Amino acid sequence: TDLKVRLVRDDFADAVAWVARSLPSRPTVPVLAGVLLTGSDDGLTISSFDYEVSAEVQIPAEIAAPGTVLVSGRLLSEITRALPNKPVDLSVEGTRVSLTCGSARFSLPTMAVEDYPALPELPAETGSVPADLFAEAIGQVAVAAGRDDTLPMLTGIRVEISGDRMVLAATDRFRLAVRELTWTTKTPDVEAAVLVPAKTLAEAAKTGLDGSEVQLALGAGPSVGQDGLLGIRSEGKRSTTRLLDAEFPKFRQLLPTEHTAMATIGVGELTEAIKRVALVADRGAQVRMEFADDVLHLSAGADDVGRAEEDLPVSFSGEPLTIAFNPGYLTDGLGALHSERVTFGFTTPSKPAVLRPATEADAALNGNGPFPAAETDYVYLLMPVRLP
Template sequence: MEQHTVSFTVPKDDFSSALAWVARSLPSKPTQPILRGVMIVADDDGLELSGFDREVSTRVRIHAEVDEPGRILVAGKLVSDIVGSLPNKPITMRYEGTTVTLSSGSSRFELRPMTIEDYPVLPELPTPTGSINPHLFSQAINQVAVAAGRDDTLPMLTGIHVEIDGKDVVMAATDRFRLAVRKFEWNPSESSSKATLLVPARTLHDAARSLDQGFTNDVTIAVGSGENIGREGLLGIETDSRHMTTRLLDAEFPKFRPLLPNQHSALASVEIAPLLDAIRRVSLVADRNAQIQMEFSSDSLILSAGGSEVGKATEQLDCAFTGEPLTIAFNPSYLKEGLSAIDSQRVVFGFTMPSRPAILIPEPQELPEADAEGNFPTPDTKFTYLLMPVRLPG
C-alpha cells in the first residue's frame, strides 16, 4: 500500500447503495482475482468508489468525513454484503498495516486488503454525445433488452443495436425467436450526430435498473463527437454522482427492418392485464415453455394449453378482432415478456398467417382501416415486439 493509514466515517445508507451499485457489475469468476475488488479513494471531497473488470467500469462519489486520506482496495461483493447487513448507523473504515477494520455500533469486521499496485487504470469517459431523460432511457432499454440473446457464442445477438441519427434514436435486440424495436428522441450535442453501436445488453439493462432509483437529472451518453462517434469502442453513461463505461461489441447486428411486416391480414386488440393472468393460469398444465394456443375470432380469444398426461386448460377472453379467424401458438415465456414490455393498457396483435411472425404493439388511438385487398397497414408505433410462432400440433 502507498500510505500507512486511511480512515473515514460514512453514512450507512449512502455507503451501502454505492457499494451495491459498484459490486453488481463485478465478475463472480474473474480472470484475475484483483478484478473482484472495489477501489475506495478517500480525499477532501469524500469518497470515490470504483470497479473495473476490463469490460465495464463503474465509479460513484459520496460524502464522507475523511480523517486520513488515501486508497483502499477491498473484495467488493464481500464488503457490500457486510455493509448491507449492518444497522443504520455511521460506519467507520480504517486501513492500517495489513488490516482493514470496518466498524458500526457494536459490530466490527477485520478484512484483508487487496494489493493496489496491480489494479488496472479505469478508462475515461468519451466526449459527451447527448443527453436523455433517465426514465425514458430506462424504459426504452427495458423494452428491448428482453429480446436480447444470452448465448455468448453469438455475440452479435447479446447486444442492443443503437442507431443515432440527430435527435432520433432506434434501439433493437433479437435472439432469433423475437425482435424488439424502440424509437425515441433525445438531446444530441450535435444535430448532425450519426452512429451505429452495439452495446452489451446485460450492461445496459443493469444501467437501466440503477437509473430507476430516483434520478431526475438528464443522463449524459458519451460515445464521442463528430466523426469520432463510436471510434473509441467505448460507451459512457453519466448521471448525478455516478458514471460507468462499457466496451462496445465488435460484431454486426442482423439487418432487422426487412423482418417487420408492413401490412397484416388480421388485427386483434386485447387488454393486457387479464391476458397475462390467463396465460399464467393455462400454462400451469403445460410442460415447461410448451406452446400456448390462441384462437382468435370476431369477439373472443380462447387460450389453451396442455393436452398431455397432466391435463388441459382453456380460458376465454374478450377481444376486438378484425380479419379472418385464425389459431396461432407461441412460447408462453416469450409471449409474457413481450406483453410486459408494452406500456399501454391494451395490446394490438398484427397477424399475416399462423406460420409467420406476429407483432405486438401498444394500442394506438385509432386502428387502421383495411385496404381494398382486406389488409391492414401496420399502425405507427414507437415500440414493436415481433414474435415467432411455434408449430401447431397435427
C-alpha cells in the same frame, strides 16, 4: 498519506452495494476481487472493475487524510451491509484498514493497490436521456435479446443514434423488440450504431439510474463507437461496458407494412388466460390462438398431460385466423407494451405477428382488410409456431 475519513452509513453502504454488483466472482487476477477507495477534497470515490464492466461512484466524505486503498469487495459489501446506523470511520494503518461503526470494529488486510488496473476513461458524452424513459425503453427491448452466451451475437441491444432520435433493438432470432425514443444530444449531430450487451445495459437501467437524467458516452463526431466502450453517467454513478463486435440483423425489412387480420384485446386478460392455459403445454410448447367473430379461443396441451382452453372477447377485424405462439415469448411481448390494450397485426399463421400498444385509430378500423400498419414507438415482432 494513508486514507483517513468519516462517512455516513447509508451513503457508504449504498455505494459499496452498487459498486459490488459489478464485481467479478472469483476473478482470474486476484486484485479484480477488490474495491478501490480513494478519498480527497471532501469526497470518497468507490470503484470496481473486471475488464468488461466498470463501476465508479462518488459520495460525500469528511476527509481527515486523503489517500487510496484496495479492500476485498465482497467482504466490504457484507460488512457495510450489516453496520449499525452510525458514522463510519475508515482509517488505513499500514497493511490494514480500520473500519469503525458504533461499538463494532473491523480490521481488514489491504490489497496490492499497485497491481490494480487503471479504470477506463469514458468517451466523450454523446447525449442525455430522461432516466425513466431510458429505463422503460431498455426494459422493453431487452426482453427480446438472446440469453445464451454461446450465441453472443444475439445477447446485445442495438443502439442507433441519429441526431435527436435513438432506436433500440434486440432479438434472439424468434422475436424482435424495437423502441424509438428522443434524447437531447450533447455534441454535434451523430449518425452511428453500436451493439451493447443487454444484461449490462438493463442492469444500468435498473440499478444505475440514481438521478433523473442519464448521459451516454460513445464518442464525438466520426469517433462514435470507435473506443469499443460505452460510458453511462448519472448523478454520482458512472459505469462503462465493452461493446459487442457483432453485426445486428436488418430488422426494418421484417416489420410488416400491412396486416391481413388484426385483433385488439386487453393485456391483463390475455396474459392471465395465456398463463392459465399454458399450464398443460409441454414446457412452453405452444399456445393456439383461434380468432373468429370477435372471439379469441385459446387452447393448449396434449392428451397425456391434459388440455386446456378458454374464450376471450376480442375486437377482431379481418379474415379468421388460427395461429400459435410460444407462451413465454407471447407474455414477454405483452409485458413490454406497458399499455392497457394490445393490438396484434397478423399476416399468415407462418409469418411474424406485430404486438403493439393499442391506438385510438384501431377502434375505428373495421372491415375485410387489408389494414395499414400503424406508427408506434415500440413494437414487438414475434415469430409464430408451426401447427401440425
